[PDB]
Amino acid sequence: TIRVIVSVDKAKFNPHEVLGIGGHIVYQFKLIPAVVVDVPANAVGKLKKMPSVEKVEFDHQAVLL
Amino acid sequence: QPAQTIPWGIERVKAPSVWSITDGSVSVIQVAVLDTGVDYDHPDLAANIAWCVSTLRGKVSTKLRDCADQNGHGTHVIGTIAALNNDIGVVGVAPGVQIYSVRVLDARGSGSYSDIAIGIEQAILGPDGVADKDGDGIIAGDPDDDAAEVISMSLGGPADDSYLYDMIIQAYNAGIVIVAASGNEGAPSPSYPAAYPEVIAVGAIDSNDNIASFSNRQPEVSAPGVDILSTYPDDSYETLMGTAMATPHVSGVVALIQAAYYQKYGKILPVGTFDDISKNTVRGILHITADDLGPTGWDADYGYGVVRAALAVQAALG
Ligand SMILES: [Ca+2]
Ligand SMILES: [Ca+2]
Ligand SMILES: [Ca+2]
Ligand SMILES: [Ca+2]
Ligand SMILES: [Ca+2]
Ligand SMILES: [Ca+2]
Ligand SMILES: [Ca+2]
Ligand SMILES: [Zn+2]
Numbered sequence: 109t110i111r112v113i114v115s116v117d118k119a120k121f122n123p124h125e126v127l128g129i130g131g132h133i134v135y136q137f138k139l140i141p142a143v144v145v146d147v148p149a150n151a152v153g154k155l156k157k158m159p160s161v162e163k164v165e166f167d168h169q170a171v172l173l
Numbered sequence: 174q175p176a177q178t179i180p181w182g183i184e185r186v187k188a189p190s191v192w193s194i195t196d197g198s199v200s201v202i203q204v205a206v207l208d209t210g211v212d213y214d215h216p217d218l219a220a221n222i223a224w225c226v227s228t229l230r231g232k233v234s235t236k237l238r239d240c241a242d243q244n245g246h247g248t249h250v251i252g253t254i255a256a257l258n259n260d261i262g263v264v265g266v267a268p269g270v271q272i273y274s275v276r277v278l279d280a281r282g283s284g285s286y287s288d289i290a291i292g293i294e295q296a297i298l299g300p301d302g303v304a305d306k307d308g309d310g311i312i313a314g315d316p317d318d319d320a321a322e323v324i325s326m327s328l329g330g331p332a333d334d335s336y337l338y339d340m341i342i343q344a345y346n347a348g349i350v351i352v353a354a355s356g357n358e359g360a361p362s363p364s365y366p367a368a369y370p371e372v373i374a375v376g377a378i379d380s381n382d383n384i385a386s387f388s389n390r391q392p393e394v395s396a397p398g399v400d401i402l403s404t405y406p407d408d409s410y411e412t413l414m415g416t417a418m419a420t421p422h423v424s425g426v427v428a429l430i431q432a433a434y435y436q437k438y439g440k441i442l443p444v445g446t447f448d449d450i451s452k453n454t455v456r457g458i459l460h461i462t463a464d465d466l467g468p469t470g471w472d473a474d475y476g477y478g479v480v481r482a483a484l485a486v487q488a489a490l491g
Contacts, residue, residue: 111231113287113336134231135287139294139304139343142336144231144287163335170289170330172209172246172282173354173364173417 110149111167115142121160129154174216174261175410181380182253182397186422187483188266191429194486196258198269199432201314204254204424205296205321207289208247208328210240210276212406215248217262221255223271224300228291229279235300243280245405249413250327252404253421254428262410263403266425266482270432273299273321278328286330290340296321297347304347313348314431314441322431322441325424326353326372327417329364338369345371350431350444350455352424354416356389361473363389370447373456376476377419382466384474388416392476393447393456394463396422423459426482430455433486442489458488 131147225240258268277292278284299319312320353367367374376388377398398419405411445454463478
């Protein structure tokens with residue numbers, strides 16, 4: 109399973125849709141239209157296929173400076 | 174506990190002379206520090222810790238246990254901003270400012286962008302979980318809200334993601350000053366998020382006023398970042414270097430500016446832009462009152478120069 113962050117169209121998105129592709133919601137942002145979700149690695153294409161999903165981004169790493 | 178010393182960096186940014194006007198202890202003012210967490214009972218920091226939260230693993234927890242510093246970096250950073258002016262340890266740039274410790278990095282000092290974004294969202298929302306309670310568009314500087322006025326990020330990565338940038342935009346629009354470390358790879362430009370226009374990228378100088386060979390170039394301003402003594406777990410002190418140690422010096426200065434301005438006028442200053450050279454915004458003030466090192470004007474090593482609290486506050490109030 110991988111963690112990714114999807115930018116969504118709020119007019120078409122509903123957190124319950126994620127379970128259909130095998131995934132689950134980790135965190136729904138309150139201040140931007142995006143959700144953190146965990147999905148199987150082979151489910152990334154299906155998310156992309158969803159009309160509510162406008163962009164899927166991998167979860168990148170930051171380090172202390 | 175050792176007797177109090179004023180670290181060379183606090184001296185260099187000209188903070189001690191500001192303290193008669195304010196030490197940052199103006200009620201509406203909070204600084205959010207997105208880092209490894211904090212030694213929350215450290216005798217030289219406790220009284221200034223207003224909120225401790227964690228966003229690790231996409232899970233927002235305010236359990237002290239989950240928010241505690243397991244690396245040390247966060248405790249050090251926080252100490253540079255807000256170590257208490259007393260008889261022990263060290264002293265911060267703004268020794269009475271309230272701190273929000275938002276733990277977005279884990280024991281290893283690495284973090285997910287998702288967690289950090291969540292961290293910025295929490296700095297905006299505050300303990301009450303609502304950005305703008307009374308719905309007037311004012312967030313930072315609104316006494317009815319609990320948002321932080323400064324977001325301090327001593328961390329970075331090479332990726333530019335749209336959700337993280339959209340959250341940065343939300344913070345800026347909430348009137349929050351965003352400050353971040355330029356990076357420690359001697360690179361030509363800053364890491365993210367310091368490289369976004371909404372954020373103040375900070376490079377590191379050493380004690381002879383030279384730029385650190387590791388400091389990522391083209392910052393906005395620069396600050397003490399080599400041999401910086403501060404608080405460190407557990408209830409102790411340590412000396413470190415990095416653009417991470419510079420960053421909090423700048424955040425401290427901002428805190429004092431906003432605190433002094435609110436105290437006189439009961440409002441805060443707009444955040445401003447990079448090109449700003451007026452006295453009418455935070456970033457403008459920071460830029461015109463910076464100690465201009467190296468070549469005249471903004472340059473690739475020091476930015477506009479070394480931040481100076483004494484002068485920034487005078488410019489804000491006059
Ligand atoms: Ca506030
Ligand atoms: Ca002290
Ligand atoms: Ca709030
Ligand atoms: Ca408000
Ligand atoms: Ca209000
Ligand atoms: Ca402790
Ligand atoms: Ca210069
Ligand atoms: Zn999961």
